[PDB]
Write a protein that binds this ligand. Sequence first.
Ligand SMILES: Cc1ccc(NC(=O)Nc2cnn(-c3cccc(C(=O)Nc4ccnc(C)c4)c3)c2)cc1
Length: 350
Amino acid sequence: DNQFYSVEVGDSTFTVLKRYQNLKPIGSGAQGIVCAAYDAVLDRNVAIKKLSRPFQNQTHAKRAYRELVLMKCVNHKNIISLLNVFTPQKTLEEFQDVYLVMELMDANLCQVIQMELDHERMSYLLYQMLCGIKHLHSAGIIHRDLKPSNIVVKSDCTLKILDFGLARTAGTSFMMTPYVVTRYYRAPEVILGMGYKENVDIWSVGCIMGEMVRHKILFPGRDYIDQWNKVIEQLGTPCPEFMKKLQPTVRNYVENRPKYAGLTFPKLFPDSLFPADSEHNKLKASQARDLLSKMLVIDPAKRISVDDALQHPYINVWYDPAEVEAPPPLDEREHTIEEWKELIYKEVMN
Ligand SMILES: Cc1ccc(NC(=O)Nc2cnn(-c3cccc(C(=O)Nc4ccnc(C)c4)c3)c2)cc1
């Protein structure tokens, strides 16, 4: 008879294939509509995300479509891999929700950030983030919105990036919803609408790394006004060659803001935030601070590249020979609700 069954999880109704049993809300994190479940066909635990009416607006539609298309043609151990895609609805006209199935992880990166972590775990997580970012870049994907909530880890320290970031050759839109966008890991180029290269994501890694060390969000704020103030208070006002690459209007505001000297990296990340129990840890702390000082650089021309960050003494220890490639093996334009509903549906049907 029926291939699917419905279950009430939290507030939402999950209508899933009968193979997925004992659904449980993840909550943190999430929050997207995400459940843990047992997959009886694969005899393994999975995570199931529900996209409710993803074609309801262009923000939801572009993202849903882009991430459905990319989750198929992107293959890397540090990037989310899709196990299954389905809709409980029978026709295009009846089509409402999309379900995305992936391997169940144990935590998001925010939970790991709260922990006091050794240099082994810190550099391993960062090596993985850098590998995932390098793979995305090689496929012409520059993220620009990498944050700990969309990064997941397993107990064995393995890491996966969940999303593909900001829309390329676009272009943001209005949201009539009660949810807040996290902007604290965004690069100065993203804050000040500058134009960017691959190392735009290194800033995000720097923000995450710094927060793993400091246990506080490095650059907080209501919006980009407060946020940019947090950047300059700590790192100092950038040099004239950087400010020359700003739009006239943006350049005016940036230069007319009060000038700060900038705190040094030993002052920003004191010796006390790292273990001093051994000579190994003494060396690891100076190397960790050295990498942070190269990542948390306002000028992208003076900021470290992904490839150099991977070759850094703090990270380069995880470089594994005979690991490459992998052991197991359009369209940024304006569309209407109905046009997107069809694009997404045919992508769900493949
Ligand atoms: C295709 C797709 C599916 C889901 C997401 N979003 C997502 O958050 N996925 C995901 C995977 N794992 N986790 C996660 C995060 C935090 C905690 C837990 C957790 O509690 N996991 C367990 C629960 C019970 N047993 C075990 C062994 C782990 C899982 C989230 C994006 C794309």
